[PDB]
Amino acid sequence: HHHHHMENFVFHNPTKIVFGRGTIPKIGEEIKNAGIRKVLFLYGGGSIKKNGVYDQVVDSLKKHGIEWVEVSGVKPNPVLSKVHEAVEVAKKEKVEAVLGVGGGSVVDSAKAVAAGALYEGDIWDAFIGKYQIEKALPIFDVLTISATGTEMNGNAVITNEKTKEKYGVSSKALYPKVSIIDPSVQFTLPKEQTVYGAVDAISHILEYYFDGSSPEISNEIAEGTIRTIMKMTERLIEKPDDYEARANLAWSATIALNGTMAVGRRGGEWACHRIEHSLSALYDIAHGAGLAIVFPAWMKYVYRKNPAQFERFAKKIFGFEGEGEELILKGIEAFKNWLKKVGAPVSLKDAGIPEEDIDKIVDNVMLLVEKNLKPKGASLGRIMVLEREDVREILKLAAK
Amino acid sequence: HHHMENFVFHNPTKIVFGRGTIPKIGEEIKNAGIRKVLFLYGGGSIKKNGVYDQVVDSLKKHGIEWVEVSGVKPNPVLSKVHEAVEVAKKEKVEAVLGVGGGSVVDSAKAVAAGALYEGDIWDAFIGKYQIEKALPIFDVLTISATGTEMNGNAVITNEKTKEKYGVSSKALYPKVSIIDPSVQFTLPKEQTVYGAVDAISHILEYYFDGSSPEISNEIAEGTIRTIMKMTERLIEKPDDYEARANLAWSATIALNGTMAVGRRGGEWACHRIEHSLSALYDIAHGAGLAIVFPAWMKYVYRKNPAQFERFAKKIFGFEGEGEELILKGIEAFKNWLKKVGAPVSLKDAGIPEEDIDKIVDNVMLLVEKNLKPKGASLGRIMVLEREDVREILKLAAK
Numbered sequence A: 001h002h003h004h005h006m007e008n009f010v011f012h013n014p015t016k017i018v019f020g021r022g023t024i025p026k027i028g029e030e031i032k033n034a035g036i037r038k039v040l041f042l043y044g045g046g047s048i049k050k051n052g053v054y055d056q057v058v059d060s061l062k063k064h065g066i067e068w069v070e071v072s073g074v075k076p077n078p079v080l081s082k083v084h085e086a087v088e089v090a091k092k093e094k095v096e097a098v099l100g101v102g103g104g105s106v107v108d109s110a111k112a113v114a115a116g117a118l119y120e121g122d123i124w125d126a127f128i129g130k131y132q133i134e135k136a137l138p139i140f141d142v143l144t145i146s147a148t149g150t151e152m153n154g155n156a157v158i159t160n161e162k163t164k165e166k167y168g169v170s171s172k173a174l175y176p177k178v179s180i181i182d183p184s185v186q187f188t189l190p191k192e193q194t195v196y197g198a199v200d201a202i203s204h205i206l207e208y209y210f211d212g213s214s215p216e217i218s219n220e221i222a223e224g225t226i227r228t229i230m231k232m233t234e235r236l237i238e239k240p241d242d243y244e245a246r247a248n249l250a251w252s253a254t255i256a257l258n259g260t261m262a263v264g265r266r267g268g269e270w271a272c273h274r275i276e277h278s279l280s281a282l283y284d285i286a287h288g289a290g291l292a293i294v295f296p297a298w299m300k301y302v303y304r305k306n307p308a309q310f311e312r313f314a315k316k317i318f319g320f321e322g323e324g325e326e327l328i329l330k331g332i333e334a335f336k337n338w339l340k341k342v343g344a345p346v347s348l349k350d351a352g353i354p355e356e357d358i359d360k361i362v363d364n365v366m367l368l369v370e371k372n373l374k375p376k377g378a379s380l381g382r383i384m385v386l387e388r389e390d391v392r393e394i395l396k397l398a399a400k
Numbered sequence B: 001h002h003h004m005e006n007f008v009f010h011n012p013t014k015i016v017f018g019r020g021t022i023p024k025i026g027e028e029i030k031n032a033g034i035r036k037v038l039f040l041y042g043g044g045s046i047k048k049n050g051v052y053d054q055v056v057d058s059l060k061k062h063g064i065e066w067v068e069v070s071g072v073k074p075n076p077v078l079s080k081v082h083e084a085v086e087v088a089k090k091e092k093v094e095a096v097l098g099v100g101g102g103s104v105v106d107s108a109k110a111v112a113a114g115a116l117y118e119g120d121i122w123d124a125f126i127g128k129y130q131i132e133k134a135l136p137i138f139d140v141l142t143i144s145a146t147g148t149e150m151n152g153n154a155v156i157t158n159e160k161t162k163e164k165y166g167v168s169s170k171a172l173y174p175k176v177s178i179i180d181p182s183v184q185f186t187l188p189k190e191q192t193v194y195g196a197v198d199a200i201s202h203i204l205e206y207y208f209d210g211s212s213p214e215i216s217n218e219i220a221e222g223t224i225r226t227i228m229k230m231t232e233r234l235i236e237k238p239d240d241y242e243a244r245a246n247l248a249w250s251a252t253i254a255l256n257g258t259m260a261v262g263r264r265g266g267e268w269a270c271h272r273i274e275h276s277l278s279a280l281y282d283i284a285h286g287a288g289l290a291i292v293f294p295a296w297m298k299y300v301y302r303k304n305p306a307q308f309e310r311f312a313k314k315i316f317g318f319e320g321e322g323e324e325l326i327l328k329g330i331e332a333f334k335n336w337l338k339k340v341g342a343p344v345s346l347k348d349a350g351i352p353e354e355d356i357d358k359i360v361d362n363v364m365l366l367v368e369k370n371l372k373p374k375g376a377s378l379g380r381i382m383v384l385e386r387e388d389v390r391e392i393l394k395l396a397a398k
């Protein structure tokens, strides 16, 4: 048998990363050197003004002769109305690029605005298979929360509040030109956000790790990165201004979804993520919080379809020795327990979502499959494609 | 400590990897807007193993016109680069397509630069010209070792001066590199092994540079352990595709920037000493590293003891502490290299101990002519003087 095949792949990631303390003043230099004179400066709720990130950025833009217009108020699960608002500004002000300053919600919004600025229609079309994004304005970002790896990929997730649809799109045109990551600006993050961001980065790795593939080099890199994220999370809970922890976690989040973990694999599973979108769409919970609930339940539901990799998970992430269903369940339980330790919800009840809502959540998941996945030939899950009834059982596993 | 150093990461090269991918070469060239290329290659292995025919068929299919220059040598020489630069210019090629190993891809990089330079491209290797622009470079890689397929480096030997020098430039990053690991099945065992030693050595030049960030250590250690496992498999079964594929990607990430993140720029003493061995005796790059690296480790470990402890625990699974552990790990590394057939002394390579002073002279020249113009020095956790280089070579002699 041949369960460790390294799949054919194409790898291409042109994004420039500028990383470390004191790097944010380079943002104006990067934009100037990229030949850009006028940007839309997009941001969230003004944590960036409060922590001095805004003044570092503005001082750099002013120093390097960059003109800008601001749009603020991007929300943590970003919404389409705000993208619409910003697209109108970008078009009316003739901006040459979009500069997102904030967390994943801002950088995803920046991508969606960069695409929409070059599209005649409603950019929501791209999230429901009615428009393939081939071109976008250049995107620059100053990242202030490490979680999603959006700073170094072509993905964006937006919620249409009108329809309660939280959907993703992926395009080469949405890779940032330059992303600046100063991990020290993360010292002020709430503990819960730090942890949710770690859970997200781990989950991105696991979506690939569990896709049925098992190349040796990819397993090694995945495992090393998971172990690093876990260690750093624990440090950050105790000491939120531990720079090396922030820095290690930041880069691990970046590589989790920059193409690194995809190499040699089968494209990833993505069932947990797509299920979680419906929780965030319906309840506005943190992405990472939803994943802490769904992932362990999914793992318990599916492991017989990929047992050797669940055994390797137990051995390589947690150091257990053994074989079979016992070892598999030991590893899944340790994962659930670690999530609980660091304070993440591991049930719907932990998050205040009642059991009697399950069927409503399942309806939302199924709509996502029809409207977001089917148009691009995607399906829910890979090692096991999940039908309505499978989604219901997983949520019932995660209910209490 | 375990500080994660500030860094800039940028690697725009596209990789197309796997079985049956070489037919994409003409498509990639076409899609890049290019019609006429210089097809550069080595000593003829590609004509005996089907690669030449795959490339030519793809170029024909996609309307790509080409001129050829062959004869690139395993330690590539400046005279052949000169020949190819003249053909490039005379024939108005729009890109350079290197099909072969690292010697060929490095030569393609040098030719792509020299094609746009009025002078002798050797200037770039001695600090007299800054390569800011070069023709587009494409490559079909047939041996995994150097990672040249996904970086901006090139090393060329000026035969007239016995100087084997490196250059790095953003302009030398390939546009597209195609890696079909299955074409490596025909490699002699020695070349497979020298390739693996070079990949491991790239990782270690970063691993031992004084820095020790957790994420960078983990990625390095997992990559080295994989290379070692796959090398052993390939010595027994050269047509083990998964072993070739895993080794291929490991060698790519070893020097594409992945190992540099959060570190201090790398040590590079072993590489730069080795270049003198290859300049003077024409030995394989990786063979020389097998000789120099263990000696260098034995010489310098007191300057970075904690990382040498970690090397022993993480690569070999040894337990304990301090110098006993450090020495166990270094000896295990040397013995592994010996096990897989690499030379681990100058004697193993047919190099006389009496020649150490002539080798040292060449190393010192490299320092004056290649390193100092670019503000670089021989070593980092210990800068190496003439005497230190001599002591390292003595430790490597037998």
Ligand SMILES: NC(=O)c1ccc[n+]([C@@H]2O[C@H](COP(=O)([O-])OP(=O)(O)OC[C@H]3O[C@@H](n4cnc5c(N)ncnc54)[C@H](OP(=O)(O)O)[C@@H]3O)[C@@H](O)[C@H]2O)c1
Pocket: A044, A045, A046, A047, A048, A051, A074, A075, A076, A077, A078, A102, A103, A104, A105, A106, A108, A144, A145, A146, A147, A148, A149, A150, A153, A155, A156, A157, A185, A186, A187, A188, A189, A190, A193, A197, A200, A257, A287
């Ligand atoms: N594109 C992708 O690769 C991808 C993949 C998976 C998930 N996602 C998406 O990304 C979004 C999640 O983004 P995220 O996890 O990065 O977090 P986020 O939603 O952007 O931010 C969460 C919270 O953190 C705060 N914050 C950010 N930086 C801070 C700082 N340094 N100090 C103190 N507070 C700070 C924000 O407040 P302020 O507004 O005041 O700054 C906000 O309330 C979700 O919509 C998810 O679906 C994208």
Ligand SMILES: NC(=O)c1ccc[n+]([C@@H]2O[C@H](COP(=O)([O-])OP(=O)(O)OC[C@H]3O[C@@H](n4cnc5c(N)ncnc54)[C@H](OP(=O)(O)O)[C@@H]3O)[C@@H](O)[C@H]2O)c1
Pocket: B042, B043, B044, B045, B046, B049, B072, B073, B074, B075, B076, B100, B101, B102, B103, B104, B106, B142, B143, B144, B145, B146, B147, B148, B151, B153, B154, B155, B183, B184, B185, B186, B187, B188, B191, B194, B195, B198, B255, B285
């Ligand atoms: N740029 C960088 O990142 C960097 C870094 C370190 C070292 N280097 C340099 O790279 C060079 C070494 O390159 P390399 O290790 O890749 O080896 P190479 O010198 O390009 O090739 C070594 C031998 O392998 C043969 N060969 C290649 N592919 C084959 C195949 N698939 N089947 C059978 N034989 C095959 C060649 O024969 P044919 O000629 O007949 O094809 C040649 O004799 C040195 O000059 C070294 O200094 C570069």
Ligand SMILES: [Fe+3]
Pocket: A148, A200, A203, A204, A273, A287
């Ligand atoms: Fe996510």
Ligand SMILES: [Fe+3]
Pocket: B146, B198, B201, B202, B271, B285
């Ligand atoms: Fe090398």
